[PDB]
């Protein structure tokens, strides 16, 4: 086990593989409540499964960080927490719905 | 003391310079009798808050347009 993650305020995780399986599984369950054809569901399920496959395949924490390519394993866990929080918020926002409103005629015309 | 409550309320009115004590009565309407406008009414209400010592939220104050209506509100 590492002595430190090197980032102030990010504590070393005793059981990183177990924590990552729990978080990715929670993300996938939350994604199951998003509409099937929503792009957020399709892309996030795709990337979440890929990371989950690496977590199962590779038991060595040093080697797992090499595959995931997302920093320290504690940075990966934090990112999975962030994604899980985002998924819950996306359900209430529902950004897969059509555009709320077109902008005025030349709102984005530069130069004027 | 409903009698005194009238006594104290009218005491305040007599000082509010824009209110002429000559034309005031317990049933005068601040707008159509004394000729005051809204922010005068707000100042009058704030005087009664000082004299009696309890809040009058804006919802309640904007109905008190006659001295009697203040007297009645004070009772409650």
């Amino acid at each position: 086990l590492k002595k430190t993650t090197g980032l102030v305020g990010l504590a070393v995780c005793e059981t990183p593989h177990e924590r990552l399986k729990i978080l990715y599984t929670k993300i996938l369950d939350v994604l199951g409540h998003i509409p099937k054809n929503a792009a957020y569901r399709k892309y996030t399920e795709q990337i979440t499964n890929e990371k989950l496959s690496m977590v199962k395949a590779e038991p060595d924490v040093k080697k797992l960080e090499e595959r995931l390519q997302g920093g320290q394993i504690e940075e990966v866990i934090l990112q999975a927490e962030n994604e899980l929080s985002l998924a819950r918020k996306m359900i209430q926002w529902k950004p897969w719905e059509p555009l709320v409103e077109e902008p005025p005629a030349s709102q984005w015309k530069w130069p004027i | 003391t409903l009698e005194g409550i009238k006594d104290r309320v009218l005491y305040v009115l007599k000082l509010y310079d824009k209110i002429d004590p000559e034309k005031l009565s317990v049933n005068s309407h601040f707008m159509k009798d004394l000729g005051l406008d809204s922010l005068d009414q707000v100042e009058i209400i704030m005087a009664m808050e000082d004299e009696f010592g309890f809040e009058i939220p804006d919802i309640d104050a904007e109905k008190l347009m006659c001295p009697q209506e203040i007297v009645d509100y004070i009772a409650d």
Binding site: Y43, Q46, I47, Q69, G70, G71, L99, E102, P103 | -
Partner: protein
């Protein structure tokens, strides 16, 4: 530069360094205040032929932005993940 031997030894001993070799006051080692005139080079556009400005006009090659989507499959990231930094072989630990 004019300090006596004893004072040189005293202040060298006090600081723990050899101060005389790296004096913070400048003497004769600095450049002369009168220098020979320069003769500066010319840039690559100094040519008498094969030098039409339209072929080396940076401003006129700038284009308006490319519209990707207007309101009129594998997931991607803005770029590949950043490669992890390596410890200095020069001196990993200060």
């Amino acid at each position: 530069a004019s300090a006596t031997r004893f004072i040189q030894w005293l202040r060298n001993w006090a600081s723990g360094r050899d101060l005389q070799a790296k004096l913070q006051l400048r003497y004769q080692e600095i450049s002369k205040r009168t220098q020979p005139p320069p003769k500066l080079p010319v840039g690559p556009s100094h040519k008498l032929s094969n030098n039409y400005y339209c072929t080396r006009d940076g401003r006129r090659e700038a284009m308006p932005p490319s519209i990707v989507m207007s309101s009129q499959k594998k997931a991607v990231s803005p770029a590949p993940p950043i490669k992890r930094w390596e410890l200095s072989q020069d001196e990993p630990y200060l």
